[PDB]
Design an enzyme around this catalytic site. Structure first.
Site, PDB file in Angstrom:
ATOM      1  N   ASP A  19       0.753  -1.256   0.000  1.00 34.66           N
ATOM      2  CA  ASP A  19       0.000   0.000   0.000  1.00 34.66           C
ATOM      3  C   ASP A  19       0.780   1.301   0.000  1.00 34.66           C
ATOM      4  O   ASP A  19       0.204   2.364   0.240  1.00 34.66           O
ATOM      5  CB  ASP A  19      -1.045   0.004   1.121  1.00 34.66           C
ATOM      6  CG  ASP A  19      -2.241  -0.883   0.786  1.00 34.66           C
ATOM      7  OD1 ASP A  19      -3.038  -0.497  -0.098  1.00 34.66           O
ATOM      8  OD2 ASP A  19      -2.376  -1.971   1.382  1.00 34.66           O
ATOM      9  N   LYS A  22       3.092   1.089  -5.121  1.00 37.26           N
ATOM     10  CA  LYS A  22       3.842   0.457  -6.209  1.00 37.26           C
ATOM     11  C   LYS A  22       3.005   0.263  -7.490  1.00 37.26           C
ATOM     12  O   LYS A  22       3.473   0.543  -8.611  1.00 37.26           O
ATOM     13  CB  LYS A  22       4.396  -0.890  -5.730  1.00 37.26           C
ATOM     14  CG  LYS A  22       5.333  -0.778  -4.514  1.00 37.26           C
ATOM     15  CD  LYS A  22       5.858  -2.138  -4.043  1.00 37.26           C
ATOM     16  CE  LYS A  22       4.731  -3.142  -3.676  1.00 37.26           C
ATOM     17  NZ  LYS A  22       3.905  -2.849  -2.458  1.00 37.26           N
ATOM     18  N   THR A  23       1.768  -0.201  -7.338  1.00 41.98           N
ATOM     19  CA  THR A  23       0.925  -0.417  -8.508  1.00 41.98           C
ATOM     20  C   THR A  23       0.464   0.915  -9.123  1.00 41.98           C
ATOM     21  O   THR A  23       0.451   1.079 -10.340  1.00 41.98           O
ATOM     22  CB  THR A  23      -0.260  -1.328  -8.135  1.00 41.98           C
ATOM     23  OG1 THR A  23       0.270  -2.570  -7.651  1.00 41.98           O
ATOM     24  CG2 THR A  23      -1.167  -1.617  -9.356  1.00 41.98           C
ATOM     25  N   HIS A  82       3.743  -9.287  -0.788  1.00 43.21           N
ATOM     26  CA  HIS A  82       5.099  -9.519  -0.328  1.00 43.21           C
ATOM     27  C   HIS A  82       5.682 -10.888  -0.752  1.00 43.21           C
ATOM     28  O   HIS A  82       6.842 -10.992  -1.165  1.00 43.21           O
ATOM     29  CB  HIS A  82       5.106  -9.399   1.200  1.00 43.21           C
ATOM     30  CG  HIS A  82       6.466  -9.541   1.796  1.00 43.21           C
ATOM     31  ND1 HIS A  82       6.739 -10.417   2.826  1.00 43.21           N
ATOM     32  CD2 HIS A  82       7.649  -8.982   1.449  1.00 43.21           C
ATOM     33  CE1 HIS A  82       8.035 -10.397   3.080  1.00 43.21           C
ATOM     34  NE2 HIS A  82       8.610  -9.535   2.258  1.00 43.21           N
TER      35      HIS A  82
HETATM   36  N1  LIG Z   1      -2.989  10.229  -1.637  1.00 37.36           N
HETATM   37  C1  LIG Z   1      -2.300   9.361  -2.384  1.00 37.36           C
HETATM   38  N2  LIG Z   1      -2.708   8.037  -2.516  1.00 37.36           N
HETATM   39  C2  LIG Z   1      -1.890   7.112  -3.361  1.00 37.36           C
HETATM   40  C3  LIG Z   1      -0.742   7.532  -3.930  1.00 37.36           C
HETATM   41  N3  LIG Z   1      -0.052   6.372  -4.508  1.00 37.36           N
HETATM   42  C4  LIG Z   1      -0.887   5.346  -4.239  1.00 37.36           C
HETATM   43  N4  LIG Z   1      -2.118   5.677  -3.633  1.00 37.36           N
HETATM   44  C5  LIG Z   1      -3.019   5.079  -2.652  1.00 37.36           C
HETATM   45  O1  LIG Z   1      -2.525   4.240  -1.611  1.00 37.36           O
HETATM   46  C6  LIG Z   1      -3.139   2.938  -1.735  1.00 37.36           C
HETATM   47  C7  LIG Z   1      -2.161   1.829  -2.164  1.00 37.36           C
HETATM   48  O2  LIG Z   1      -2.024   1.825  -3.608  1.00 37.36           O
HETATM   49  P1  LIG Z   1      -1.167   0.778  -4.363  1.00 37.36           P
HETATM   50  O3  LIG Z   1      -0.565   1.389  -5.602  1.00 37.36           O
HETATM   51  O4  LIG Z   1      -2.190  -0.347  -4.664  1.00 37.36           O
HETATM   52  O5  LIG Z   1      -0.130   0.104  -3.405  1.00 37.36           O
HETATM   53  P2  LIG Z   1       0.953  -1.021  -3.518  1.00 37.36           P
HETATM   54  O6  LIG Z   1       0.457  -2.107  -2.537  1.00 37.36           O
HETATM   55  O7  LIG Z   1       2.362  -0.582  -3.159  1.00 37.36           O
HETATM   56  O8  LIG Z   1       0.875  -1.581  -4.940  1.00 37.36           O
HETATM   57  C8  LIG Z   1      -4.361   3.094  -2.715  1.00 37.36           C
HETATM   58  O9  LIG Z   1      -5.592   3.356  -2.009  1.00 37.36           O
HETATM   59  C9  LIG Z   1      -3.940   4.256  -3.565  1.00 37.36           C
HETATM   60  O10 LIG Z   1      -4.972   5.030  -4.139  1.00 37.36           O
HETATM   61  C10 LIG Z   1      -0.379   8.985  -3.845  1.00 37.36           C
HETATM   62  O11 LIG Z   1       0.590   9.404  -4.461  1.00 37.36           O
HETATM   63  N5  LIG Z   1      -1.180   9.785  -3.058  1.00 37.36           N
HETATM   64 MG   LIG Z   2       0.191  -3.661  -5.690  1.00 37.16          MG
END
Ligand SMILES: Nc1nc2c(ncn2[C@@H]2O[C@H](COP(=O)(O)OP(=O)(O)O)[C@@H](O)[C@H]2O)c(=O)[nH]1
Ligand SMILES: [Mg+2]
Ligand SMILES: [Mg+2]
Lengths: 391, 12
Positions: A19, A22-23, A82
């Site tokens: 979260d 990354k995606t 992970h």
């Molecule tokens: N406010 C904000 N939310 C983000 C940002 N980057 C990712 N998200 C949020 O944080 C959460 C995790 O996103 P995600 O890309 O799926 O995380 P991952 O698990 O690393 O792949 C989601 O609810 C996204 O909308 C950002 O730059 N700003």
């Molecule tokens: Mg992801």
């Protein structure tokens, strides 16, 4: 006109705690680079739903996307959880010439941030670049300072050059939403991929290495060994070392053949036959390798990172303990070995990953980065990567 | 060796 795939090719991927973004960052990179230089933009949804891929008899959820900067082509990997990064990094299912570490400015480094960096150093990920994400949520230009300090120190703690590491302050989500100021940060990130990660060395450019499979004699001409060239090139007339299992022997390539066609050289990726001068069939055996002289040595003990297959991945139902003496499959053959778990650990559960110190019954030609499978009577139970050769 | 499209094999 790069349908001819003429531009330099680099494999990268996003790592970091769940979260942290990354995606979203991956979707953002494809989207922003597409607008700026043309290309296929990808949505969060399609990248998020990672299809299952088979690495070493191991199932991993991985999403692949590609993108282009004016000077390069990138193949980029992103995973849901992970476990996927653990398995991906250990089996090397996805090549990583460099990694983009995503750290949420709101949270700062977290457990997985550390494990990814640690594993990155253990499996050989050469370069890391940081995208400090969720900066739209943090205006405290000072607290952003602390996170960066934390990340830099964290990187150096694992032997990455923290002080010289490029760190971009941005917002994947906002760049993905069209926010122009934030999109500039995505471009800044891609510029660092361009400038910081050096173009990867081609397997064809690495020292010649061919794992031996079959060996047969040809009345008059000599002994030939078959196998797929793992890397490099072997030309007729060149010397080679036969490494592993037995003591190292020297020989000369006196012929190369593929599909019954004699060639003057064998290249990485080709399934060839190599004629060796003055070597008998009895001296050569499946499991040894043909290598450019001086480039690889036989070793019996090493430190490694291993992933134990879960019950569902077709792995053990029960854990194993020290005293365990499985078969370690290196390239073309099995070699029984002795294990030493980390201090105080008595068992390894299916699905766990831990550093293991292994001692083989006989030498195998190896170096840091060599992948291997662990198995019990053929049945695959784990996958590992050599992190450090001990002796 | 002995191959011919892509399986292990050879000659020399
Ligand atoms: N406010 C904000 N939310 C983000 C940002 N980057 C990712 N998200 C949020 O944080 C959460 C995790 O996103 P995600 O890309 O799926 O995380 P991952 O698990 O690393 O792949 C989601 O609810 C996204 O909308 C950002 O730059 N700003
Ligand atoms: Mg992801
Ligand atoms: Mg913290």
């Amino acid at each position: 006109e790069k349908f001819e795939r003429t531009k330099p090719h680099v494999n990268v991927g996003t790592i970091g705690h769940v979260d942290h973004g990354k995606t979203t960052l991956t979707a953002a990179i494809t989207t922003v680079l597409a607008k700026t230089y043309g290309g296929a933009a990808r949505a969060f949804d399609q990248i998020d739903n990672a299809p299952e891929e088979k690495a070493r008899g191991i199932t991993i959820n991985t999403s692949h996307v590609e993108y282009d900067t004016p000077t390069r082509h990138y193949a980029h990997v992103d995973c849901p959880g992970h476990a996927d990064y653990v398995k991906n990094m250990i089996t090397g299912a996805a090549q990583m010439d460099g990694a983009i570490l995503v750290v949420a400015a709101t949270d700062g480094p977290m457990p997985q941030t550390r494990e990814h960096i640690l594993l990155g150093r253990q499996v050989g990920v050469p370069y890391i670049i940081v995208f400090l994400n969720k900066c739209d949520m943090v205006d405290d230009e000072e607290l952003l300072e602390l996170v960066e300090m934390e990340v830099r120190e964290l990187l150096s703690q694992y032997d990455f050059p923290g002080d010289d590491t490029p760190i971009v302050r941005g917002s994947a989500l906002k760049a993905l939403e069209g926010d122009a100021e934030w999109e500039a940060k995505i471009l800044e990130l891609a510029g660092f991929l361009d400038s910081y990660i050096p173009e990867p060395e081609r397997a064809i450019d690495k020292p010649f290495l061919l794992p031996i499979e079959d060996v047969f004699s040809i009345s008059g001409r000599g002994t030939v060994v078959t196998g797929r060239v793992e890397r490099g090139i072997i030309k007729v007339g060149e010397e080679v070392e036969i490494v592993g299992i037995k003591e190292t022997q020297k020989s000369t390539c006196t012929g190369v053949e593929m599909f019954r066609k004699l060639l003057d050289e064998g290249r990485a990726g080709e399934n060839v036959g190599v004629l060796l001068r003055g070597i008998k069939r009895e001296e050569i055996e499946r499991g040894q390798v043909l290598a450019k002289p001086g480039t690889i040595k036989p070793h019996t003990k090493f430190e490694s990172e291993v992933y134990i297959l879960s019950k569902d991945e077709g792995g053990r139902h029960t854990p194993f303990f020290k005293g365990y003496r499985p078969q370690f499959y290196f390239r073309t053959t099995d070699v029984t070995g002795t294990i030493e778990l980390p201090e105080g650990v008595e068992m390894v559960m299916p699905g766990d990953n831990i550093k293991m110190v292994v001692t083989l019954i006989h030498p195998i030609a190896m170096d840091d980065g060599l992948r291997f499978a662990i198995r019990e009577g053929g049945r695959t139970v784990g996958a590992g990567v050599v992190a450090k050769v001990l002796g | 060796s002995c191959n011919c499209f892509c399986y292990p094999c050879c000659s020399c």
